[PDB]
Structure formats: structure tokens, C-alpha cells
RNA sequence: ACCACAAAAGGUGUUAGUUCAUCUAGACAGCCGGACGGUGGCCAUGGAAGUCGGAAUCCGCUAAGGAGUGUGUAACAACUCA
């Protein structure tokens, strides 16, 4: 018998979190969070997929479980 | 032989001893006249540390520095009739308020004679303690005789 | 004038570090004014007791790394209600004055510092 | 100001084990078990080790940080109730009419019966909640002792036993009588 | 600032209270007045101060302001 | 016969309080705020009068 | 929008901002301990020691302690506050 506080296993926004862009001209492409601006905007660039470096609101983008 | 210690107080010549010394095997009416042999100079209000050894009244006199500053002042009054305050301002005693105040058991945590001579020389609120000035503003100018008492 | 009093504290602590060499950090806890008064009266010859804010002592030690860095080993021992005793007598007589005198029913010595090292005394 | 996260740390002693699923909390210790439903408050429990659990509010306002702090206080009261237990000593006040307090069983409900409060003929009754026991004080006059696990049950039973003895239509600072909570201690004698 | 506040209630409207500059019965900002005190241009009359001018006749400007021109600090 | 060991805790629960002006409610002595929304949580207070 | 209403004053309901002071040179808050001595100062003396009442409003040790913030009391003790 121990402390059975279970998981609540999230995926987080952080420097290095890789995201999937789903709204806009980038339209479904992998990008990486470079530097996080605030609670809603981040700065991303996904250069081997083709999306340019840009600030973006976290509505237009969806987090992936991967990191680096 | 036992130890009884009391602190008697202000009285003119023979001026409620009974309630404080009934359990120490001492008198009530003879104890009031036993304090007349100490506070009779010394006609100013002071305290008396009495020490009764369970069979007699042996009262001593406590060294009081404010009463020593009152011992270098004007005593004029008799009893119950001065009609305003029974107070009197008097002579300065610029050197007598520095030897007697530095000899009253050296209290108040002093490390100098200008410390006690200002503690019991600048607390004068009944006397002026100067011929052309007043007290309580001479503590920063009294810097003589500090090495003599220490 | 608060900055002036705290700069005065810096100045006098730098003064009393660079003049004395025997340090007694004392564990004075819940001490009354009746005990401390007969400590101020008794120590008029050799030892200077310095109480005060031990968390003001932290940055005072932090700013004194340029001169005499051997006072670096005191910040873990400023913990608790402690005071300082500045004297030139190394071990015995000051420890006999502080601990043994004025007890009734806390005056101990928890740290002894002599020219760089620590001693249990 | 929408703090980005706030956290509190709950300290867990040796003899207790806690089990938190979604927001249901179960705490097991040497006096028994307690459970509490915290589904209404939106906080996340996170074990950092067997002795320490961090609670957190991510992107929360001001009310929500206050709710995090009171989650910490409630889980701490459950832990201290399952280790030590709570024990309220209440003391009677009467000038002329002696308050008479019995413990009766009425259809298996174990009511506390108050009689002769200020000479009232109304026989006052207070129910006893689950998990609280009631003793009377040895060698101290006019004292009841309620002891149990949770602070809520013990304190609310003590408040029910207090507020059943209010004084109506009189002066409350002249008629001072009632049953007041005097001491709020723990069941263990050392603490 | 808590006495005109106490009178602010016994007026209509929603008027405010600002702290004045310039020795505020006269004009002429507080550092400019402290610079004109050191020159001697500032002659005390009852409850308000007459100021020196550089366009008057010279004779009565000298006899009404003896301390401006001189070697006084 | 109250024997003021019992009366002091009574005055602790009852008498040592503060009183607001516009709403006339019982308030704690260090509290400076009324908790109600019909009076508008006003701040003017007084100490409660003791006996005589 | 016309347009079919709202005010003076408030609110520690919440958010943002200005200025000052302490400002990490451990701040406030809390808990623990102090809260000295001259000094029952001078007095009106049944009794007044901070404390029914009057004026002076000090000094030393200080890390800090008021010729004292209330209570208690024939007067003190004593708790408590800066």
C-alpha cells in the first residue's frame, strides 16, 4: 500500500515540443516550438517540412506526443 | 532566623505598614516610628528597602538617584500647606549631580560618568539644574569628569 | 534614514570584524531584558556582545568575500536565534562568563571561531 | 492575473497511504479510513514521492488559487484526522438551572438529550453523526468530549449541540448560558 | 488633501483635487522661485510678493531692490 | 454565579465583536468588511457596547 | 444611436494603473521571548507606582523597551500594545 495518485498524463507545451499545424497556409505539417511567447502564442519553425518560422496562436495548431 | 523583605515609601516624619508586614513577625505601630530614623536631608519622597530577620524591624535606605537630585534642591515645606504644588526649583549643582548620581549603585547600565550624570541629571522636571539654562538639553554638552568616576 | 542606519550597521560590522579575532556565536533563545542587562554591565572589560538581525548578517557576510574570506564558513551557523561575542580571549574565560553566569529556573555558546578555524572549546 | 501554475505540497507521514483517483481521495491510517469527493474544484494531484504530493492549478485565476490552498488544507485535515484524530472539549455554562445532558437510543439513532436548559420544558434532541463518539469528563464538572476522525463531523456535531441551546427574546450578554466549545485538541495524549 | 476632500462632498458635480506647483498662490514654478530668491528679485510685500522687472526706469528699480545687483551671495 | 472562567469564554464568543452601521450585524473585531451583498460590503464600523 | 431613464455616495467582487515609504540591505503578516533602569520622577497624599486628576515629554544600555495602549486595583502585582 502506497500513494496511488495515478497519472493525468498530459502532453505539454514546452521548448522543443513538436506540433502539427492544421489551420492556415501550412495546412497539416510538422513544426517545432522554438520559443514560447505567452499563454496563447508560440514561435514555431518546421524547416525540413516547409513551414516558415512564425508566431502562431495555439488555436491553429495541435500538439503531438513527441518531443526532442 | 528568616528573611523578610519589604519596600516602604514616601512619608514626611512618621507618615499602612500593617497589611504588608503581619506575616513577617514584626510590629505595626512601632514599625512606623522605626522608619522615622532614616527619612528625616532626606525629607524628600524616596523608598526604603526594609529587611526584617523575623524578630525585629531593621529598615535600610535604598539609594535613589532622582531623590538624590531632589537632595540637591530646595526642601522648603513643612506639611499639608503650600497650597499649590509644594514644589521648589533651586540651585544648579553642576558637580554635585555628577558624584552623587554616579554613586547610587551605578544602575541603568552605564559605562561612563557622563552617562549616569545625564540619566539622573537630565531627568530634572522639578528643578532647572542650571543658572542660565535648563535640564534635559545638556546631555550632549556634559563631557567632563567621565574618567574620574570610572 | 533607514538606508543610513543599515549602512551604519554595515560600517560597524566591518569595524568589529577587522578589530577582533575571537568570535563566540551564542545560542541566545528567549532571553529576557533582566538577563541581558547584567550581561551589558559585566562585559565592560574584554568582550563586546553584538545581538541583532541574523538575516541582516547574511548579505553582510555575502558582501565581505573580498576582504577576509574565512568568514565564509559562518552562514550555516547563523541559523537559529544566535548572537555574536567579539573578544580577544581565545577559549576559556569568555565561555566561562557566558554559559555559567546568569541562569535561573538560554545563555550557551554554540560556535567558537579563532582566526580561520572552528573549535568545540 | 491568470498565474501560469500554482502548486502546494502535502506532506505524508509514515503510517498512512493515500489513494487519489480522478478527484476521489481515500486516506488510510492507524485510526481508520477517510474518503472525500473533490470533483467540484479542478485541481490535479501529483505524487513526487511517498511522503510528498504536489497539487497544482494550471492557468488559473485568483478564486482557483484560493481553491487550491483549501484543497491542501482539507487533505491535511484528513491526514491529521486519520493519524491523530480530533477531540473537542465543550463546557457547560449555567447560572441557576443545571443543564442535564444524556445519551439515549431512539430507534437506533443515538440522540443526545438536553433537559432543563434555563428551565425549559422542551426536551431538546441532537442527532449524532457517523464516526463521532461522545464521552463525559472525569473529575472536571460540566464537560462533554466529542472525538472522531474528520474535523467536519466532530465540529458540526459540536455546533449542533451548541446552537440547540440559543437564548431567544432575552439579553445574550446577561443570560450567558449555553454549551460552548472550549478546547480543540487531538485524541492522542502527547499531541 | 483630507480637508478639501471633506468639502468636496458639499458641492455638486464630480470635481477633483490636484496638488499645486509654483508656490501656489503666485505663478512661477517652485525651482524658478528658488532661483529668483537667490538673485534678490523677490521683494516681500504683505501676503503677496512684488517681482523685479527689467523694463522700468533704473533709479526706482535700484532704490526698490538694493540687494539684486550687489556682491551678496 | 458564573465564575468568570466561564464568563470570559462567553464574552469571547459573544461580547468581543464589532458592529456595522447601515446593516446592524455582528462582525469580528479585526474584520473590517461586511460579507453581504444587499448592503454593498460597506466598511464603516464601531466596537460593540459592553455592559454599562 | 433618436428611444422610450437613472444620480450623489460607497464595495478587500474582480482587473489594470499612478505616486510615496519599507524595497531581496530577508519586508509585512503570523507564532515564540523581551517590552529595562533612573522612577512610587515632581504632586494634589486615606490611598496614585503609566493608568479618578495637572504640567514638564529627558537620559544611558541598546537589538529593543513609552515619565507608557487599554484592563485590574483602597495602592501595587499582572496581561497586553508601539
Swiss-Prot record, chain A:
The listed locations are:
Cytoplasm
> What does the UniProt record tell us about how this protein is modified after translation?
N-terminally acetylated by acetyltransferase NatA.
- Tell me the domain of life: Eukaryota
- Assembly and interaction partners: Component of the large ribosomal subunit (LSU). Mature yeast ribosomes consist of a small (40S) and a large (60S) subunit. The 40S small subunit contains 1 molecule of ribosomal RNA (18S rRNA) and 33 different proteins (encoded by 57 genes). The large 60S subunit contains 3 rRNA molecules (25S, 5.8S and 5S rRNA) and 46 different proteins (encoded by 81 genes).
Report further notes. Present with 45300 molecules/cell in log phase SD medium.
What does this gene product do? Answer: Component of the ribosome, a large ribonucleoprotein complex responsible for the synthesis of proteins in the cell. The small ribosomal subunit (SSU) binds messenger RNAs (mRNAs) and translates the encoded message by selecting cognate aminoacyl-transfer RNA (tRNA) molecules. The large subunit (LSU) contains the ribosomal catalytic site termed the peptidyl transferase center (PTC), which catalyzes the formation of peptide bonds, thereby polymerizing the amino acids delivered by tRNAs into a polypeptide chain.
Q: What protein family is recorded?
A: Belongs to the eukaryotic ribosomal protein eL14 family.
State the protein's name: Large ribosomal subunit protein eL14A
Its gene name is RPL14A
Query: Span of the full-length protein shown?
Result: 3 to 70 of 138
Curated annotation (Swiss-Prot), chain B:
Q: Name one GO biological process term.
A: ribosomal large subunit assembly
Gene name per UniProt: RPL12A
Q: Record's Gene Ontology CC terms?
A: cytosol; cytosolic large ribosomal subunit
How is the polypeptide modified once translated? Although not reproduced with a second method, methylation at Lys-3 cannot be ruled out.
Q: Does the keyword Ubl conjugation apply?
A: yes
User: What is the official name of this protein in its record?
Assistant: Large ribosomal subunit protein uL11A
- Lineage of origin: Eukaryota, Fungi, Dikarya, Ascomycota, Saccharomycotina
Q: What PANTHER family does this protein's entry cite?
A: 60S RIBOSOMAL PROTEIN L12, LARGE RIBOSOMAL SUBUNIT PROTEIN UL11
Please tell me which positions the record assigns to the cross-link Glycyl lysine isopeptide (Lys-Gly) (interchain with G-Cter in ubiquitin): 117, 133
Q: Where in the cell is it found?
A: Cytoplasm
UniProtKB/Swiss-Prot annotation, chain D:
List UniProt keywords, sorted A-Z: Cytoplasm, Ribonucleoprotein, Ribosomal protein
Give the Gene Ontology MF terms in alphabetical order.
Answer: rRNA binding; structural constituent of ribosome
Q: Which GO terms describe its biological process?
A: cytoplasmic translation
Origin: domain of life = Eukaryota
Gene Ontology cellular-component terms for this entry are: cytosol; cytosolic large ribosomal subunit
Instruction: Give the UniProt subcellular location, in the record's own words.
Output: Cytoplasm
Q: Which Pfam families match?
A: Ribosomal_L6 (PF00347)
Q: Which family does it belong to?
A: Belongs to the universal ribosomal protein uL6 family.
PANTHER family assigned: 60S RIBOSOMAL PROTEIN L9, 60S/50S RIBOSOMAL PROTEIN L6/L9
Q: What else is known?
A: Present with 52400 molecules/cell in log phase SD medium.
The free-text function statement in the UniProt record for this protein reads: Component of the ribosome, a large ribonucleoprotein complex responsible for the synthesis of proteins in the cell. The small ribosomal subunit (SSU) binds messenger RNAs (mRNAs) and translates the encoded message by selecting cognate aminoacyl-transfer RNA (tRNA) molecules. The large subunit (LSU) contains the ribosomal catalytic site termed the peptidyl transferase center (PTC), which catalyzes the formation of peptide bonds, thereby polymerizing the amino acids delivered by tRNAs into a polypeptide chain.
* Protein name as catalogued: Large ribosomal subunit protein uL6A
Instruction: Give the source species.
Output: Saccharomyces cerevisiae (strain ATCC 204508 / S288c)
Curated annotation (Swiss-Prot), chain F:
Taxonomy, superkingdom? Eukaryota
> In this UniProt entry, which cysteines form S-S bonds?
none
- Cross-link Glycyl lysine isopeptide (Lys-Gly) (interchain with G-Cter in ubiquitin), sequence positions: 17
User: Which locations, inside or outside the cell, does it occupy?
Assistant: Cytoplasm
Q: What does this protein do?
A: Component of the ribosome, a large ribonucleoprotein complex responsible for the synthesis of proteins in the cell. The small ribosomal subunit (SSU) binds messenger RNAs (mRNAs) and translates the encoded message by selecting cognate aminoacyl-transfer RNA (tRNA) molecules. The large subunit (LSU) contains the ribosomal catalytic site termed the peptidyl transferase center (PTC), which catalyzes the formation of peptide bonds, thereby polymerizing the amino acids delivered by tRNAs into a polypeptide chain.
Q: How does it assemble?
A: Component of the large ribosomal subunit (LSU). Mature yeast ribosomes consist of a small (40S) and a large (60S) subunit. The 40S small subunit contains 1 molecule of ribosomal RNA (18S rRNA) and 33 different proteins (encoded by 57 genes). The large 60S subunit contains 3 rRNA molecules (25S, 5.8S and 5S rRNA) and 46 different proteins (encoded by 81 genes).
UniProt-recorded name of the protein: Large ribosomal subunit protein eL40A
Which part of the entire protein is covered?
77 to 128 of 128
